[model samples]
Target chain A: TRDQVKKLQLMLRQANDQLEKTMKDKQELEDFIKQSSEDSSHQISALVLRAQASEILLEELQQGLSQAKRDVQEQMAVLMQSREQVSE
Target chain B: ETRDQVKKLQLMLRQANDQLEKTMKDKQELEDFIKQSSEDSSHQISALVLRAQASEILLEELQQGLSQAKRDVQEQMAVLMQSREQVSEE
Candidate 1:
């Protein structure tokens, strides 16, 4: 049981790490986006192209978030199982 | 057994959701950044195009890979939890 709990904690830590990494990536991307737009001439073609890409990325990120939510749910289910076993 | 497993799953799901939410926020920030930058610099088309391309790639990767990873993790967790429950009860 102690080992199980430790493993669970480790998993949680890993998840946190992943979350942090994602955040950092997001920030870097934002910086790049800003820099690009600021330096460009507002050429409709370029803006449109970038906008389209951003839209796609936004959609993808949203979907990923949804999936992550489901993942957390699954993790919770496992934790509950561990608790029940301990009680029994 | 089922209850406990579900609880663990739920926690993981929450984490996943949190990551997703963060990502979405980041996306918005990026969008705003681009919009503002475009307004300010109105002359650097080449730079703008480059940034747009980079953002697009990042977004695609995040969307496809992150979702797939989440799904895989969930499925694996479910299966593992179920097995553990069955074994323990037996």
Candidate 2:
């Protein structure tokens, strides 16, 4: 009977050890997730901001090119008039 | 009395095993959730980076085009000025 009691006690101790170890692992994972999520969130925000800045710059460059095209058209019109006047 | 003690020990061991199993399951679920979240964040960041790179490339090309257009306009202005001088002299 004593031998049986001793065997049960050993099994209970082993089970408690396993439970504690699992609980510790769970806590560690929770902590890691919290920190990782914070870091990733900040990184995502920075990336979004950078992309938005690029979009604004692209818009500005497109407008500049449009203005330049208009200038070129006006100059071409002036040159054609000069050529016609010289011919007549 | 010894038999009663053995029964109590048996019950205590069973309860301990059950709690351990439940905790392991919870840990497994948490692991799965964390893994999925990490992968989703990585994909989102990569997409944003690609968009930014493309915008930058377009900006460079447009700037070059504008510069060339300005040079062409100046060259045309010079030609018109020389033609007018020729007409006035003749």
Candidate 3:
């Protein structure tokens, strides 16, 4: 009957709506992934740079410590010589 | 005829349903991939952060050691100067 036709048409309309909605959701998810990936990449680059800077700073500190150790040794030698002169 | 049109609409509805299911399945797969990718990124970031923290600690220790060494040098200089004064006086 015509009523049956009307019902089928309505069902078709509903089905098409669902299909469009699902497709839109899929597209949005894809866009989100793309944006998220870009953000992660940028963050990773910054972190790597920071880590490298820290490494260089550590090396500089170690070298400074080594120089200080040498300075201490030199001072000890001078102290020993002074003591000997005093004893004489 | 109404009968023919109803049959056609039924076929169209079936096709739309199939397409919707396929899209939903694709979206689900994409979600899984996104989850996995995010986890991987998180792990990498954590490792980098740990390395940065370790470097910071090491730098602090080295700075402390350098300061102590400098203090020791100053102390030795003071003792040497005092001994020199005594030698000159005697």
Candidate 4:
């Protein structure tokens, strides 16, 4: 009959061990998720900033190209007129 | 012995209850982080992509315009040179 008390102790030990294991798993999962989320957030913020900075640089490049086109067109027009007069 | 078994069962149940409470809290925190990230960051990233697309289109148009200008200048140079040649022939 005292053996029954030993059986109860074993059961209690098994139950406590299972609960501890479950708690540890839950904590690890929570920690991993939180850390991964933070890392992803940092990467995304960096991506957004890079895109914005590159956007300004791209805009400036486009403006320069447009200005070059305009200046070249004007200079070509003047050259064509001067050559035509010389031919005349 | 029976009393001891009952007491063991009681303790087991209490431990399970505590684990349940902690598990619930952990799940809530992880889910909250996921929700906030998707809500705020996803929205801003979407806007950034949309604007990036606009910039791409603008750059394409400018490239097309620049190439067309080059072609026009080439054609005009040919025209003016031919006129000059005709004057020389006369």
Candidate 5:
């Protein structure tokens, strides 16, 4: 139980950090949209290109983080089973 | 005990799968939005480039016309001054 909890916490912390990073990129692209509005011209096209590039990166990050979340969830379930067997 | 863990694991797995599936779909939607935005932006860039090109051509023609008119004014001044000098010589 001790090691399980420790591992769980560690994985969960990493999960939180990953999620935060994903969210930050989304917020950043949203800024590109905002900055695009602040200045209008051919610059807007360039700004949208900037937003588009970041959106690609953020989406990839979100995918990885979501997968990692499931993985940690699976790890916890497996650990729970292992604990039950040990106690028995 | 076996049945219980299996049931719990199944439920947890389903939840995890559901969470993952939902997130993927959500991000998929955002990707669609981002993609559409990118396309619209491309069209905008094309129009901007066209507009700039037109302006450049117009500015070039205007500059040429202005230069020619400037030369014409100088030639007229020279001709008038020469005519005045000839009349004075006579």
Candidate 6:
């Protein structure tokens, strides 16, 4: 049972990493746009793309976080039932 | 056998409750952190957008100035060329 739960944790960790990477990319793109020549369409587009990607990853991260929280709640409920029966 | 299983389950349930409470507290803290970070990101993005827009506008203005200057120089050159041609004809 713990093993199954550990797999969920692993997935949660992966999702967090993905979110972090996307955030970093977004920041870098923003910086590039800042330092870029005003006439540089390339930089502006890159920044826009990065921002879009970051938003998507942020949503994914949120979903993953919610799922992990739900898993914990479920597991806790199961554990409580077991504990109560043992005590009785 | 049934009694024993019930007893075990009861013990597990109690432990589970404790775990649940602890996880709930942890979740609350996580929520706080997430909220704070989100606010920070929002402010940062807003600043970035403002800066980017300023730079673009300034660059456009500078380019406009350059074009105006070039036009002035061309007009002066044309006047000079006409004067030279008149002097030659004279």
Give a tens-digit lDDT track for model 4, residues A1-88. 5566676667667767776776777677678777887899899899889979998998997898789778888987988898899998
Residue A83 error, candidate 1, Å = 3.4
Clashes per model (N, Cα, C within 3 A): 46, 0, 0, 0, 0, 23
Model 5 lDDT at residue B46 = 96
Per-residue lDDT tens digits of candidate 1, residues B1-90?
A: 655765685588587768768787777777786677666666575787798799789879867976797688789779988998999998
Regions of candidate 4 where Cα sits further than 4 Å from its true position: A1-18, A38-63, A66-70, A73-88, B1-20
Error of 1 at B30 (Å): 37
TM-score attained by model 4: 0.58
lDDT of 5 at A15: 54
State which candidate, 4 or 5, has the greater TM-score. Answer: 4
DockQ of each: 0.14, 0.77, 0.70, 0.23, 0.03, 0.01
* Residue range A9-86, candidate 3, lDDT tens digits: 888888888888889999999999989878878987997898799789879967976886687688679868978999
Worst 10 residues of 6 chain A by lDDT: A30-39
What lDDT tens digits, residue by residue, belong to model 1 across residues A1-88?
4556566667777777777787787778867766664655465677679879978987996897888788789878988998999998
* lDDT for each residue of candidate 6 in B8-86, tens digit (9 for 90 to 100): 5555555555655555555555556557765886798899889989978986996797578568658866986997899
On lDDT, the stronger of 1 and 6 is 1
- Tell me the lDDT of candidate 4: 0.79
Q: How would you encode candidate 5's per-residue C-alpha lDDT over B1-90 as one tens digit per residue?
A: 655545555555555555555555555566677689879978987997899799789879967975785686588669869978998999
Model 3 chain A worst lDDT run, 10 consecutive residues: A67-76
By lDDT, the better pick of 3 and 4 is 3
Better of 1 and 4 by DockQ: 4
Q: Tens digit of lDDT per residue, candidate 5, span A1-88?
A: 3454455456555555655565566666666666765666676678789879978986996796688568668857986897899898
- In candidate 4, residue A19 scores what lDDT? 66
Ranking by TM-score: 3, 2, 4, 5, 6, 1
